[PDB]
Structures are given as C-alpha cells and as structure tokens.
C-alpha cells in the first residue's frame, strides 16, 4: 500500500496512530517521528529517512503533519520536493487518519488518496450545535 | 547586480507587526520576504508562528546572516524582488561587507531601551547603531527614517545630527 | 477564560495538549480525558465531570474531541445538551488547538470562539502540492 508517515511537534504522532489502531486494528506500512526541542529540520530529515527505509514506498508516500510551516512540515517538504507520488498534508486529525487508512486498502491511486485525505480531514471538523 | 533585486530593506526588531508588513508588501510589490536574524533563526516556535501568519500570496523565510549572503549569491532569485527584514543596522553593514549591494536603508522601528537615545516616536539608537548608520552614509548609501510610507520621510543623519552634534 | 476539555479514544488527548504547549507555553484552564477499551459513555461522563470540577466554566466550556459519533463525542454530547455556552467540536487538530488557545486570551465571546475553532481547524488541513 501507499506509505504513511506521521510527524508532529512533541510526541503526539505515535498516539494519533495508536488511536487510529484502536479504531481500525493494527496498521502496516505506517511510520512516525517525534520532534524534541533542540532538534532542527536536518535532524528530522534523518528521522524521516530512517522510517522510510522500513516502509514500502513503491506506490508513494504521504506525510501527515500537525501544522503548516512547523519543523515537521518543513523537513517533510524538503524530502517530497522533486519526488513523484510524495506529498505533505498539514492539519492531521483522526477523521483524516481513519478515512485515509481505510481507503488505502482498496488500492486507490496516489492523487485519489491525497484528495480523500484533505476532504475527510476538513469535513471531520464539525460542531454539534 | 545581475542577481536578486532588493526591493526594500526595512529594519524592525518586531519583524512583522500589525499591517505594516501587509501595506508595505502591496506598496512595495513584494511577493517574498526574508528575515535575517540568528536569534530568531534559533527560535523554532517563533519561526512557526511567523510562517503561519505570512500574508496570503507572500512567502516569509527565516535565515541567518551567513546563510543570507549565500542565498543572494544564487542567481535563482535574479530579478526576483525580495524585502530584507533586519533587527539592527549592524547586520546590514555585514551584508554590505560580503559584497551585498544596498542603495538605501529604511528604518521601520526600534524598541526603545535604557542607555539608548530616542530619535523618533519609536526609534532608538545606541552608540553602536549610530556608528553603523554613519558607515552606510559614508558609502553614499541613503538612510531614511519613517514608520509608514504615508508619513513624511526624515533623514537618519539629520535626526542623529541634532542629537550627536 | 473559556474552559477547554480534550477527549479522544486512547491516550492522544494529553499529547495533543503537550504539543500545543510546546508551541505556546503551558496552558491554564484546560482538561483532558482518555478512553480505554471496556469503558462506556457513562464512565466518560464521570471523567469529564471530574475534569470540569477543576476548571473555571463560568464563561463556557468547549469540548474538542477526535471524531464525530465516537464515545468521547457521545458522552460530551450528553453533557452539553441543555447548557448555555457548552459546545462539542469534532476533528480536533493542532491548528484548531493553537488558534483557539491563542484567541481565548483576548477574551472572545463564546460564539466567536466556537466559530474560530471550526474555521481554523478546517483551514489548517492543506496539502503542499
């Protein structure tokens, strides 16, 4: 399947994955990194690369990060730059993770998965009222 | 000269505050903004906030003085109009010494502080800031002090001349 | 300020708060709960109530939860039902948390904060491309 790597400031990426697996069962071909004060984008690029070495990236890689413009985002941006089937999507939330992981198994195309992740992430934000 | 084009050099210890950056961006027709400061470059939290509030259609970058000289040494931005943001005139003289070409420097604002002399409503200078301005003027570089482009332009030397002789 | 309570399946709520505090500094008047397999909505209602007892809820309470329809959402829904200035917003993400925590200090009205949280949460989901 398409590889997914989650990165967030601090130690939330591992827990967002754990939450998803509590809903969907353990997932394959998913990696994550943490970002600790003192580290820079270059440290993070190495961390992302070490995770990718263990993933099947033949169909592509989707980096799901916490916020636009943070170090996790900046480092992921430097990796995907001239790579086909590599994308970075900011604002990762549980609706995005769950929908994306579910669709991934039905072997969608890369563009289809990227579009679904953005759409479900946004539609997942809703007030009860 | 056949490399990047400095659309404008604004000095401000606050970098982006209010719409000074919004209005100056549209009037200066700038689509890129580069921040030169080692103290800010060392603040990953501040960089994130500045990058997330970067005006729409405008990109904000954060680099150090050494890295900035290299970005300018790349013709990839030739013709591109970029705005330089500095926190102190000392960092401006450093870029000039690296062979950076500057025709004029604009003083946007400087947080006042004890031991410094107030030259404008919100512009303060220390014996170090004044010394840097004098060197730029000795090189034929123009020095103008103004908070907004709609306010009257004053000459840095004139303000410092009525204070420091 | 307006109270904020974060709830997700698993143990991610505490980490989403930690991530936010890494960006903004330690926060006051914020609570969180976890949801473990075996627990039901009634357990969660008690957990939310115990957290609320420690919060200043005079200006209102905003429950930020992981997904629409999960237990964390269902339990929070039962608490806010006929309460003024109580709301539940699903799809919590870092952009929503950061913007919401920042605005809260400028003492916005309850409706203003709820609207900002939904808007920033959705606008925070963006692909690099």
From Swiss-Prot, chains A, C:
The modification N6-acetyllysine is found at residue 54. Changing residue 47 to C: Retains more than 50% of phosphotransferase activity. Changing residue 9 to C: Loss of phosphotransferase activity. Unable to dimerize. Induction: Expression of the manXYZ operon is positively regulated by the cAMP-CRP complex and negatively regulated by the Mlc transcriptional repressor. Expression is also weakly repressed by NagC. Changing residue 109 to C: Retains more than 50% of phosphotransferase activity. Changing residue 11 to F: Slight phosphotransferase activity. Unable to dimerize. Coiled coil: none annotated. Residues 1-123 form the PTS EIIA type-4 domain. The active site is at residue 9. The record marks 88 as: Involved in the phosphoryl transfer between H-10 and H-175. It is found in: Cytoplasm; Cell inner membrane. The modification Phosphohistidine is found at residue 9. The PTS EIIA type-4 domain is phosphorylated by phospho-HPr on a histidyl residue. Then, it transfers the phosphoryl group to the PTS EIIB type-4 domain. The phosphoenolpyruvate-dependent sugar phosphotransferase system (sugar PTS), a major carbohydrate active transport system, catalyzes the phosphorylation of incoming sugar substrates concomitantly with their translocation across the cell membrane. The enzyme II ManXYZ PTS system is involved in mannose transport. Also functions as a receptor for bacterial chemotaxis and is required for infection of the cell by bacteriophage lambda where it most likely functions as a pore for penetration of lambda DNA. Homodimer. This is PTS system mannose-specific EIIAB component. The chain holds residues 2 to 130 of 323 of the full protein.
From Swiss-Prot, chain B:
GO terms for cellular component: cytoplasm; cytosol; membrane; plasma membrane; transmembrane transporter complex. It comes from the Bacteria. Residues 1-162 form the PTS EIIB type-4 domain. GO terms for molecular function: kinase activity; protein homodimerization activity; protein-N(PI)-phosphohistidine-mannose phosphotransferase system transporter activity; protein-N(PI)-phosphohistidine-sugar phosphotransferase activity. The active site is at residue 17. The phosphoenolpyruvate-dependent sugar phosphotransferase system (sugar PTS), a major carbohydrate active transport system, catalyzes the phosphorylation of incoming sugar substrates concomitantly with their translocation across the cell membrane. The enzyme II ManXYZ PTS system is involved in mannose transport. This is PTS system mannose-specific EIIAB component. The chain holds residues 159 to 323 of 323 of the full protein.
């Amino acid at each position: 399947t398409i590889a997914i790597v989650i990165g967030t400031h601090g130690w939330a990426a591992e827990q967002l994955l754990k939450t998803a697996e509590m809903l969907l069962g353990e997932q394959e071909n998913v990696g994550w990194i943490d970002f600790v004060p003192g580290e820079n984008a270059e440290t993070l690029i190495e961390k992302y690369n070490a995770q990718l070495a263990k993933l099947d990236t033949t169909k592509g890689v989707l980096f799901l990060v916490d916020t636009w413009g943070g170090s996790p985002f900046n480092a992921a941006s430097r990796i995907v730059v001239d790579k086909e089937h590599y994308e970075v999507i900011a604002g990762v939330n549980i609706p995005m993770l769950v929908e994306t992981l579910m669709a991934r198994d039905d072997d969608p195309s890369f563009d289809e998965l990227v579009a679904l992740a953005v759409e479900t992430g946004r539609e997942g934000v809703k007030a009860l009222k | 000269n056949d490399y990047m084009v400095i659309g404008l050099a604004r000095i401000d210890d606050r970098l982006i505050h209010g719409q000074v950056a919004t209005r100056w961006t549209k009037e200066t027709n700038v689509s890129r903004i580069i921040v030169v400061s080692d103290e800010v470059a060392a603040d990953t939290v501040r960089k994130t906030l500045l990058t997330q509030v970067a005006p729409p259609g405008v990109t904000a970058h954060v680099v150090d003085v050494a890295k900035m000289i290299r970005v300018y040494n790349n013709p990839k931005y030739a013709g591109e109009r970029v705005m330089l943001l500095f926190t102190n005139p000392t960092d401006v003289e450093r870029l000039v010494e690296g062979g950076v070409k500057i025709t004029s420097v604009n003083v946007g604002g400087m947080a006042f502080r004890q031991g410094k002399t107030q030259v404008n409503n919100a512009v303060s200078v220390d014996e170090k800031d004044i010394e840097a301005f004098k060197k730029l003027n000795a090189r034929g570089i123009e020095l103008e002090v103004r908070k907004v482009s709609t306010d009257p332009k004053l000459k840095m030397m004139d303000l410092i001349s009525k204070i420091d002789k």
